[PDB]
Each structure stands twice: as structure tokens, then as C-alpha cells.
Design a protein around this ligand. Structure first.
Ligand SMILES: Cc1cnc(NC(=O)c2cc(Oc3cnc(C(=O)N(C)C)nc3)c3cc(C)oc3c2)cn1
Ligand SMILES: OC[C@H]1O[C@H](O)[C@H](O)[C@@H](O)[C@@H]1O
Ligand code: NA
Length: 448
């Protein structure tokens, strides 16, 4: 054992972990670069080259007028596929979750939308309604270049999705064609929204100050209410339109280069979309645990962890799940949670190993919270400027397992947003069934 040696080991761990550190000035730099990229995406002259796409959603600030009745909602791209029946009068919901097979997410668009339509049929039978033709709202968690609220092309798949025959095509069309091939129900697709947009809309229902939507789950993204005069891609300068930032692609033109560590390059190189969604790759739950796994292998290689031996499970891709980062950070101090996770990964951890794993986890999750804060602060700061407000009071609607379930992420992120947003009063609100509800609310408003 030896307490002097255990300590020397932790000091070398720290020297390696220090590379994850971001100073307040680094965050301001990241923030200013994000803001610079947001200006670029919005303008007709730089839009095509901008990494931050600032996509117009065609979701407009509207005086009101919501339709009443039953609305169907689809949710694709997060954790599984969701069908929701929404009753607008007051709003009450009925919903079901379906696990997407790998062969559908990685095969053809036809296989993907065929399975989606099968699930819709199953929801409609379970609620005895495959006869009623309802207005349908679609939450599709991928970058889309809209022509309208109900017409838009998939730019590229993100988060490991790889279905062929989808990119370059109208997503509403793919969906509608799949419903027709099946021929056992009818739906009128009225709106297609990003998950950030759906979250902002359902959160707004509860707090009219909500004009920003943020997702920190499998992926990381944000939307906000932009002035129509700043939305150059849409003719008109009156009122506001929701803009899908698609901020996950920040750094794809080299904007984050000085901050990318070896672990970031490896995660990127072994991903389905290399060289893409690099800022998301620093924060998203699809990558967080993999980043911790990589740091642990580096520490095993320096003979600082697990007697310099890594098990087959520790050398398995995606074995250190993001939920384990959350669970390791939940540990009360006894080390029991850390121990069980490590034992299940075929390791024989000492008390010191448990503490080192704890440290690698906090170094990755604190970096994610800090990188994510520079992005939110850039959006909020830009809004304060555009609205020419001395003190801007805004509510941010947030969804996703990383922000929701990670034990300290949310706190580190809020504190870092606050530091970067002086003269801003930000209220953070967590969405209760965010996406589904949101896509149906936009549908009720659109269905006039
Ligand atoms: C074509 C088109 C263009 N823009 C929109 N625009 C919209 O649908 C719409 C709905 C919104 O949120 C709502 C949430 N719930 C309700 C509600 O209480 N209902 C009963 C639905 N209403 C609005 C918000 C909130 C902001 C900041 O912008 C919005 C736009 C919709 N369709
Ligand atoms: O789901 C979270 C986010 O993940 C990825 O960044 C997607 O490209 C974006 O559309 C989505 O909002
Ligand atoms: Na405009």
C-alpha cells in the first residue's frame, strides 16, 4: 500500500487531468467564437460556409389562436422512438416509447420510417384510434433546412444515425410515404420541429418567459427566439422566429482546435461522423462515458490505475457508459457505487483506484458543463444585445439525461453561465415530457 506512494500516484493522475481545465478567459474566447459563428450562420453571405447553421424553423412568435382536440406527436432521435396523444382544450397526454432496432437506424430510410409507421399503428391500436385522422407534429432531432414548418430536408445524420436515402430529402415526405406504404392509418403532418424547439414550446406553455430551448442528452443543441430582421434566410423583418443553432457543429471548421485533447480525437476518429459535431463531442452523453474510458486507459498505461492492467470490458467500446459517470459522481464517499461499477467491468479496484476514477469522471463532466456554458452564454448575450436590454430576464427550457440526471453537471453549468452572463437574469426550467408535448402544441397553433 504505502500512503506516501498512493499520494504520489494521485499527484501524477492530477497532472494528467489538469489538461481538461478551462480558465474563465478560455470560456470567453469559446463564447466569442460561438457568437462569431452564430452571426456568420444567420447572414446570407456566410451561411453556406458557417459551421453553426443557425437554421430557421418557421416557428414564429404568434399573437395566439390555438386549435382544440387530439393531436398526435412523434419523437425521433433521442433515447428511443415516442408516440404521444395530446388533448388540447388545458393539455393532457397519453404516450408510448419504442426501442429502435440497430438494423433500422443503420439500414435504409425505408426500414427506419417503416418501423416508425408500425409503432404509430401499435400506439393507435392500444388506444383504439387507428380510424381517426389527426393533425400530427413531428419531433425530429437532426439538422434540417426548412422551406416551411411542414417541409424540410435532412442535412446530415448526427449521433450515430446512418440510414441511407434520408440526407437531401424532405423528412416529412419520407414519413408520409411510409404511412402510405403501410396503408393502415391516416395522419396529417402539420409541423416538423427539432427537439430543442419542442422543449422551448412545452416549457413556454408553463412560463411565457421561455424563449430558449436546450438539449444536453445523447446530443447537445440549442434554439432561441431571433429577431426576424436578423434572420436573413427568411424574407421579413417583423416579429421573431425560432432559430435552431445546431451548435453541435461548432469547431468543425477548426474553431476549438487548441482545446481538443488526444481523447477527443480518438472518440471522433472512432465515431460514425468523424470531423463532425466536435463541440457536441465535448458534451453529449453519447460520448461522455467513452471519454472517461479513454482517460482511464491512459492512466492504466502510466501504471497509475488497476496495477497497469485493463480488463476486456475496460478495453470494450462504449463499456464505460455515461450513466456510470453520473453514478460515480453520486457516490457518497464510501466508494461502494464506484466499486460495483468497476467490479462489473472485471476490475479489482483498490480505494485509490475508485478515487482516481471519481477524478477522471469530474474532469470530463466539468469540462462538458463549462464548454456548454460558453455556448448558452453566447446565445443569451447575443439576445440581450439584439433586444437592446439593460438587464435581460429570460427563461431557458432544458431537456436531456446529462443535464437532468448527472449529479453536479447542472450546478457547474448554471454557475459558469451566470459568470459569463452579467446583466442577465436566467431562469432554468426542466421540461416534463418536453418533446412530444411541444410538437403537438406547435401543431395546434399551426393547424389554423
Ligand atoms: C405556422 C406556424 C408558425 N408559428 C407557430 N408558432 C408556434 O406554434 C409557437 C408556439 C409557442 O408556444 C406555445 C405553447 N403552447 C401554446 C398553447 O397554449 N396551446 C394551446 C397550443 N401556445 C403556444 C411559442 C413560444 C414562443 C417563444 O414562440 C412560439 C411559437 C406555429 N405555426
Ligand atoms: O438531440 C440533441 C441534438 O443532437 C444533435 O446535435 C442534433 O444534430 C440536433 O438536431 C439535436 O437537437
Ligand atoms: Na428576415
Amino acid at each position: 500500500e504505502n500512503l506516501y506512494f498512493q499520494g504520489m500516484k494521485k499527484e501524477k493522475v492530477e497532472q494528467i487531468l489538469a489538461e481538461f481545465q478551462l480558465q474563465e478567459e478560455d470560456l470567453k474566447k469559446v463564447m466569442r467564437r460561438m457568437q462569431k459563428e452564430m452571426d456568420r450562420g444567420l447572414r446570407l453571405e456566410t451561411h453556406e460556409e458557417a459551421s453553426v447553421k443557425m437554421l430557421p424553423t418557421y416557428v414564429r412568435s404568434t399573437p395566439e389562436g390555438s386549435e382544440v382536440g387530439d393531436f398526435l406527436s412523434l419523437d425521433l432521435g433521442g433515447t428511443n422512438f415516442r408516440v404521444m396523444l395530446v388533448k388540447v382544450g388545458s393539455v393532457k397526454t397519453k404516450h408510448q416509447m419504442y426501442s429502435i432496432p440497430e438494423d433500422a437506424m443503420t439500414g435504409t430510410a425505408e426500414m427506419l420510417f417503416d418501423y416508425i409507421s408500425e409503432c404509430i399503428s401499435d400506439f393507435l391500436d392500444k388506444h383504439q384510434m387507428k380510424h381517426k385522422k389527426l393533425p400530427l407534429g413531428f419531433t425530429f432531432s437532426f439538422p434540417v433546412r426548412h422551406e416551411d414548418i411542414d417541409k424540410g430536408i435532412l442535412l446530415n445524420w448526427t449521433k450515430g444515425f446512418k440510414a441511407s436515402g434520408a440526407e437531401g430529402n424532405n423528412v416529412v415526405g419520407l414519413l408520409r410515404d411510409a404511412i402510405k406504404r403501410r396503408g393502415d392509418f391516416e395522419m396529417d403532418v402539420v409541423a416538423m420541429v427539432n427537439d430543442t424547439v419542442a422543449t422551448m414550446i412545452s416549457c413556454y406553455y408553463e412560463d411565457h418567459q421561455c424563449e430558449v430551448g436546450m438539449i444536453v442528452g445523447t446530443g447537445c443543441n440549442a434554439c432561441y427566439m431571433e429577431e426576424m430582421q436578423n434572420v436573413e434566410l427568411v424574407e421579413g423583418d417583423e416579429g421573431r422566429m425560432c432559430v435552431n443553432t445546431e451548435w453541435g457543429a461548432f469547431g468543425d471548421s477548426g474553431e476549438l482546435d487548441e482545446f481538443l485533447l488526444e481523447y477527443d480525437r480518438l472518440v471522433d476518429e472512432s465515431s460514425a461522423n468523424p470531423g463532425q459535431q466536435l463541440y457536441e463531442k465535448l458534451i453529449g452523453g453519447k460520448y461522455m462515458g467513452e471519454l472517461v474510458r479513454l482517460v482511464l486507459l491512459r492512466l492504466v498505461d502510466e501504471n497509475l490505475l488497476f496495477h497497469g492492467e485493463a480488463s476486456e470490458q475496460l478495453r470494450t467500446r462504449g463499456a464505460f457508459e455515461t450513466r456510470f459517470v453520473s453514478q460515480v459522481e453520486s457516490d457518497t464517499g464510501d466508494r461502494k457505487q464506484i466499486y460495483n461499477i468497476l467490479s462489473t467491468l472485471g476490475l479489482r479496484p483498490s480505494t485509490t483506484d475508485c478515487d482516481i476514477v471519481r477524478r477522471a469522471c469530474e474532469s470530463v463532466s466539468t469540462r462538458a458543463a463549462h464548454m456548454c456554458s460558453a455556448g448558452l452564454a453566447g446565445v443569451i448575450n447575443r439576445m440581450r444585445e439584439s433586444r437592446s436590454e439593460d438587464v435581460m430576464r429570460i427563461t431557458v427550457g432544458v431537456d436531456g439525461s446529462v443535464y437532468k440526471l448527472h449529479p453536479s453537471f447542472k450546478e457547474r453549468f448554471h454557475a459558469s453561465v451566470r459568470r459569463l452572463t452579467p446583466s442577465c437574469e436566467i431562469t432554468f426550467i426542466e421540461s416534463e415530457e418536453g418533446s412530444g408535448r411541444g410538437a403537438a402544441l406547435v401543431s395546434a397553433v399551426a393547424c389554423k
